[PDB]
Amino acid sequence: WTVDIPIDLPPLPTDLRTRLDAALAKPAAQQPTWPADQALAMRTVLESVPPVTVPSEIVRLQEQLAQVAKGEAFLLQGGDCAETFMDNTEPHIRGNVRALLQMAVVLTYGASMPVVKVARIAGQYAKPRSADIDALGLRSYRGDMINGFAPDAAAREHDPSRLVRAYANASAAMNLVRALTSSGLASLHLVHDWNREFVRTSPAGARYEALATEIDRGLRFMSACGVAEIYASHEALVLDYERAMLRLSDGDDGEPQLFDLSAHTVWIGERTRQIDGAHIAFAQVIANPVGVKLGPNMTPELAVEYVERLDPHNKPGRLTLVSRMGNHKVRDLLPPIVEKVQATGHQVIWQCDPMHGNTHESSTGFKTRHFDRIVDEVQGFFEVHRALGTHPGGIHVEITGENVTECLGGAQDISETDLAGRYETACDPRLNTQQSLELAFLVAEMLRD
Amino acid sequence: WTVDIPIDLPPLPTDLRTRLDAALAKPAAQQPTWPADQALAMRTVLESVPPVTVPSEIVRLQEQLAQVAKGEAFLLQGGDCAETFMDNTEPHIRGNVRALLQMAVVLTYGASMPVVKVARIAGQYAKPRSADIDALGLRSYRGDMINGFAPDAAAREHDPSRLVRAYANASAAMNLVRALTSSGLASLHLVHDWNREFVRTSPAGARYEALATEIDRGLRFMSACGVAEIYASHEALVLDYERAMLRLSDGDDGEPQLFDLSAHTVWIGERTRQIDGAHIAFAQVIANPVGVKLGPNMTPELAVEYVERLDPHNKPGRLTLVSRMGNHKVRDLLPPIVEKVQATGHQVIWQCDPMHGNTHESSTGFKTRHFDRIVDEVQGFFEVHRALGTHPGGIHVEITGENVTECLGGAQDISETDLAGRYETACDPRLNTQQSLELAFLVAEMLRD
Amino acid sequence: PEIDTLREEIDRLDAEILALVKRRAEVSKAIGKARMASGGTRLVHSREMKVIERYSELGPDGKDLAILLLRLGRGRLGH
Amino acid sequence: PEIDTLREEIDRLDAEILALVKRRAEVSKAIGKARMASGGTRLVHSREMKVIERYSELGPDGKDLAILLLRLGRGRLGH
Numbered sequence A, B: 001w002t003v004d005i006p007i008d009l010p011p012l013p014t015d016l017r018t019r020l021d022a023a024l025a026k027p028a029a030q031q032p033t034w035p036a037d038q039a040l041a042m043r044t045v046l047e048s049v050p051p052v053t054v055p056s057e058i059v060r061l062q063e064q065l066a067q068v069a070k071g072e073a074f075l076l077q078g079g080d081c082a083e084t085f086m087d088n089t090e091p092h093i094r095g096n097v098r099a100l101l102q103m104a105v106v107l108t109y110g111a112s113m114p115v116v117k118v119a120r121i122a123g124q125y126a127k128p129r130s131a132d133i134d135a136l137g138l139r140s141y142r143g144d145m146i147n148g149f150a151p152d153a154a155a156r157e158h159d160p161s162r163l164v165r166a167y168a169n170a171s172a173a174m175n176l177v178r179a180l181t182s183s184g185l186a187s188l189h190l191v192h193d194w195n196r197e198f199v200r201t202s203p204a205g206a207r208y209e210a211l212a213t214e215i216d217r218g219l220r221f222m223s224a225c226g227v228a229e230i231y232a233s234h235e236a237l238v239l240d241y242e243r244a245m246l247r248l249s250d251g252d253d254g255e256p257q258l259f260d261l262s263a264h265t266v267w268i269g270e271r272t273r274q275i276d277g278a279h280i281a282f283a284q285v286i287a288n289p290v291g292v293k294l295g296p297n298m299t300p301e302l303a304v305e306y307v308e309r310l311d312p313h314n315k316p317g318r319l320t321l322v323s324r325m326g327n328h329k330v331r332d333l334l335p336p337i338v339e340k341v342q343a344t345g346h347q348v349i350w351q352c353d354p355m356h357g358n359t360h361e362s363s364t365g366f367k368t369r370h371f372d373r374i375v376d377e378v379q380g381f382f383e384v385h386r387a388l389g390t391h392p393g394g395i396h397v398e399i400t401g402e403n404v405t406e407c408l409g410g411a412q413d414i415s416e417t418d419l420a421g422r423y424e425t426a427c428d429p430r431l432n433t434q435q436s437l438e439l440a441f442l443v444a445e446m447l448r449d
Numbered sequence C, D: 001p002e003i004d005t006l007r008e009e010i011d012r013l014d015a016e017i018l019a020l021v022k023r024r025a026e027v028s029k030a031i032g033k034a035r036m037a038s039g040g041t042r043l044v045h046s047r048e049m050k051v052i053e054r055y056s057e058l059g060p061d062g063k064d065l066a067i068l069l070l071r072l073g074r075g076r077l078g079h
Ligand SMILES: O=C(O)[C@@H]1C[C@]2(C(=O)O)C=C[C@@H](O)[C@@H](C2)O1
Pocket: C028, C029, C031, C032, C042, C043, C044, C045, C047, C048, C051, C069, C070, C071, C073, C074, D007, D010
């Protein structure tokens, strides 16, 4: 029923303490409303636990994201919209790890350059809400780090013990993804046989067979000539969790720096990116690579201010700007943002989020996304970058290794009536096994010279 | 004018001496008619010279040809019809080495397996003749190891000092091919850029551009994932040369064996393959991989007898059977040969020679070959093997890195009137730079699954 | 000389095919431009699947002919 | 509703194209069978270059349409 843990370390450098305290004294949107004394007790437990990631892996990610920023690699970021403790199981994790590897080999062939793989995993347990009371009149579900999905009042109370449950689930998952990435799942030939089974059994396989066959000949060629790292990420939302997981280490200049060891990279969402808020200030104090989500109310001028605050030393790949405009708005809204930022001399990664600007409620009462709109935003994103001569750096996608019925369309041609089949997401609709693979194939075509 | 060399070693094992003597006491077709005393003096010089090849390289070739025989690699053999001392220069050798490397990367991609590269080089200095008096009434030219190309009687006398000149030219050439194969010419990316320049400038480039682009994406993919041996061969024709270049070494069973160190592999031609003759018997005494040319008068029964005499220990890849039937005869004549040999349990390499069964004299007075007939024989060869379920193991082709005008057709559409432009071969017409590349692309299509 | 006569026919069939392919691309463009001015997407996934499916009677190469016609109509992706 | 009308046209153009492609392959086969029974080659390199060249007005994809028509006529190589 309950685990019991008793409460009964070296100080930070004086300047890092001052800066951390100042970041956390700024106002913060979307925080849990639990008591400060209970939060503090939970953070004290987390301050001594083994970290989810280590500094050397974060420094290595930074070097790989620098190549992406310079136009010599591509970033694939993907996973569940919301991880749940309930589905934090071996089959679910393996299914997502495999999906990401499958998409990555397809994208690598299309881009003709390395693909950096960042999973939404081992921490994606918190979400923001526009309304604190939902459609059933209950306090809103804010992810398993905060409260329960169950539609009852007791379940929806904010519960600080979920910080520690979140850590435990994150460690366990990350342990498995490390294991899985040094196993036979690694092998590029095994990973691509899955894609060819997908081509054989998919209703739209004829659309993708030529490209699947060409990839298979590239792999066999490589072998005829004599011839896996998955990073963890989540939205840095709950500051009690992120601050508890900070650790001091010597950074890429040999001086002690603060690393958030809850993940390798984190991003700041649309509702928490206040320029003078705690999330942006917290991002300025940590050594991790960071991303900021940019929606349709973004100005070129605010985008530059984010770049100058978050990438003050002009470190290629330290900052990612994640575009989510809507498929009908991206072609008009993005170019002015890109031009103004390019002119600063900084090298950010431009990443497309084709999911969050394109959501709508179906007549059957399910929030859903159409495949054609998702594809069209990624396409428009590539067009904006071709015209300006800039690098389309990656995609940020929400997916699952399960055959869910959540997003409309694809090869399966999922309808409004089919959405009830198994709509399993705890939050936003995921592209299923098939639809995620389809998009990787379509984006690989977009990447071709 | 002349180099001067004075004449003024351990005995073979008793059984190897007995067997060598017996092989050489058999009748031998197509031999030079110079005095025995002068031949002996020249062979004594050659018996102490550094060899052109070494036993360990021949044992390694055998292992690679075994894979070809088992259906897991492909053999590309090619070079000048006749090497001349005159053209034994750096540009000519480099041009042929590069042509072979260019064709090989194309074939490797198409076959989806390794390609073993054997050049007709560093020894292809002797040819047989059906007539001892040629069309000008002169004694026939028999290659620079025997006499001179020049149309005068003094030049056509058989000259035993050419055994030593042949060695000297062979060493020098082989030295350079070793150097060239461990240089920047090695790089697969450099080799394939030449093919793409060929595609850009060839009149028939549109025929080959899709495949060239697909290969380039395979190479870039290989590099995005984090990722040269040329063997010497010639027809073993002049027994004075081949016997002088024998050396004793421990073979693939640890027992002393005789290796012909004038080359890595040799073949026996149509006019010297008498089953009870010295060439076949000599081939039985050496440890090198061997080939036998099979024309349209070959019976399935004689083919088996060659296999049983030449591959008595059932060593995959030790024997190659080189088919040259004519494009109009290969589909009918080859299947019975292949079926009878497959049924013995031996694993020979089946190699296509699309050149020698398809020669004709043009109206302008030049011996020539049509490209369509060369392509059609290779095609028919593949069809014979598809139908029987056997492995089409390779091709034996005559080529040059120069833009000669010798074979009719190709992208350039060489005509009878164009053949006079620069018909440079000392013997049979070679496929030029462009036409050799074209055939490699066409054969790569034939190899596709 | 049945070959010259038969090749004479293939020439006609190629002029006929070429002209219907040029036509199809212009019509394909006009459908794309109308949908886009009206706020709709560039491509329609389900419709491209219909187009692929109706060349399946040609065998394995049928889908590659359809995909090639789609490229001539709505262009290459991400351009 | 100009889209339905325009798509209605593309359907016709696809039925038209499909039928001329089936025709071309049958004629292509008959030229190959006549030449081969008479002792000639399977393929004619210079003629395939003419066929490729006369689809060049379609742009870069033109040669790939021609090569695809050649495969439907004389089959894949080495088969
Ligand atoms: O909706 C459409 O019909 C048009 C034509 C098109 C085609 O080329 O056939 C088919 C589907 C769409 O992706 C594009 C291309 O718009």
